[PDB]
């Protein structure tokens, strides 16, 4: 159970919490703004999934400040996670290449 594998699991676990909180917070921030689309929990959930994967569909995006701040937190958490997996993967391959040359 090496650091990079511990950290990736921690990042993935953390991301799911950021997603769930992110869905919940979006709805609480958006409701009140006229025309806001992120006003239901299941909708905001899949919005979060899209946003965490840096994907935007049409005008399915927050309009409020805090809603957009949530979006920022979701995005950053998303990229950090899928950047940490790559880093963890890279560490695994470089470790084996060190074993490959007997180094």
């Amino acid at each position, epitope marked *: 159970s090496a650091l990079h594998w511990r950290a990736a699991g921690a990042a993935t676990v953390l991301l799911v919490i950021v997603l769930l909180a992110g869905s*919940y917070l979006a*709805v*609480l921030a*958006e*409701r*009140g*703004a*006229p*025309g*806001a*689309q992120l*006003i*239901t*929990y*299941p909708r905001a959930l899949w919005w979060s999934v899209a946003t965490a994967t840096t994907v935007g569909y049409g005008d399915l995006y927050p309009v409020t400040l805090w809603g957009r701040l949530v979006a920022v937190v979701v995005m950053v958490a998303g990229i950090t996670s899928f950047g940490l997996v790559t880093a963890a993967l890279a560490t695994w391959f470089v470790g084996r290449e060190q074993e490959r040359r007997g180094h």
Partner: antibody
Amino acid sequence: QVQLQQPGAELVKPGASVKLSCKASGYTFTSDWIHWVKQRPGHGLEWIGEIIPSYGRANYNEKIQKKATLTADKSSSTAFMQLSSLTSEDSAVYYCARERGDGYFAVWGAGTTVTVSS
Amino acid sequence: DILLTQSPAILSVSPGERVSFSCRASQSIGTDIHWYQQRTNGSPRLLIKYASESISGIPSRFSGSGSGTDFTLSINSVESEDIANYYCQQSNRWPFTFGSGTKLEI
């Protein structure tokens, strides 16, 4: 079982204020939203507001005048609607409804028949 | 604010026949719409959630149709207990809005 409970009727003098109550049993999540709907005699349904009891943030219909102000007591699971400066146009049945935060209002209240007269 | 339009206002039908209430939104709302039944003196009762999905306890005679702007609530074999006002309610954008209503008559 009956989920939401409202007083049957409320009498108010013209210009005076009134607080309306709405307690709830059964499943009461943190994510729950309590709305309030206005129905005049022989008229359609009219959304007035919504409030999440666990945080106390309320939203109001800005199309009509903001006469109401929403508050909620956490321990009693009861939502309140503070209406002030009432005219004859405020004489209506007022419903409270439980919304799981997914659009539809699943369970409704009995309704409070408010009459504005001297 | 989404404007919902229920045409016609009053709907008359023969007993045992099929009936259809239409509700049109001011703009595309997908399937984010809900139907409510309200009889005399009674409080609103949920019939069909999300355009077509049925609620348990609700008769199998009730079924929902439509997407986009055109939406329809339909009853097969209309009986006495169905005489009521019928309301469509959207949940696509804030704030939530209701239709004017459609009264059923036998």
